[PDB]
Amino acid sequence: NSFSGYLKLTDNVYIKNADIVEEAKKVKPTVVVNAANVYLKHGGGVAGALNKATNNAMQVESDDYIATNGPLKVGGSCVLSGHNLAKHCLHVVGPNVNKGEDIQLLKSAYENFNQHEVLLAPLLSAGIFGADPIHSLRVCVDTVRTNVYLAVFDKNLYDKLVSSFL
Ligand SMILES: O=C(O)C1=C(c2ccc3ncccc3c2)CCC1
What we know:
Bound molecules: (2P)-2-(quinolin-6-yl)cyclopent-1-ene-1-carboxylic acid
Oligomer: monomer
Distance between the termini: 25 Å
Catalytic activity: Thiol-dependent hydrolysis of ester, thioester, amide, peptide and isopeptide bonds formed by the C-terminal Gly of ubiquitin (a 76-residue protein attached to proteins as an intracellular targeting signal)
Membrane topology: Multi-pass membrane protein
Subcellular location: Host endoplasmic reticulum membrane
Organism: Severe acute respiratory syndrome coronavirus 2
Subunit structure: May form homohexamers. Interacts with N protein.
Shape: globular
Strand order of the largest sheet: 1-2-7-6
Strand content: 15-25%
């Protein structure tokens, strides 16, 4: 958890313009959050990038978790190995509002972060899930009570989030 170069937005939310894969490889945090789907199929976005950085070890483990436990619920999570990226990966399912899933479940999704004192994470439901990323940061700030270090890849999005916040 030796994070560096973050800007503190609130007592417990920090942000950096960084690639979450590179941050995980540098810091090897106790927990890295994945922006997952209910079947843990890590096909694109942050999920595809974290799985690729494990050379598909994350996907093989996830398929076994699903065969034994069934799919997650939207707003839910599971804890699996972080492989080379972290001690643990917290796979969290935010709603895909582009498919009619309820935006209220974004609060439920962020509540899962409270089971861990420190996390490295992306914004949930941003990208292909369709939620406005600045709304997702507001829900994170209003819901997460533990220490969360948010990595945002895109510089234009990062500058917009920092300006809206501070
Ligand atoms: O943080 C961003 O800029 C966002 C996304 C993203 C998408 C793909 C990524 N592939 C590798 C590492 C980080 C990634 C991050 C999806 C929406 C917002």
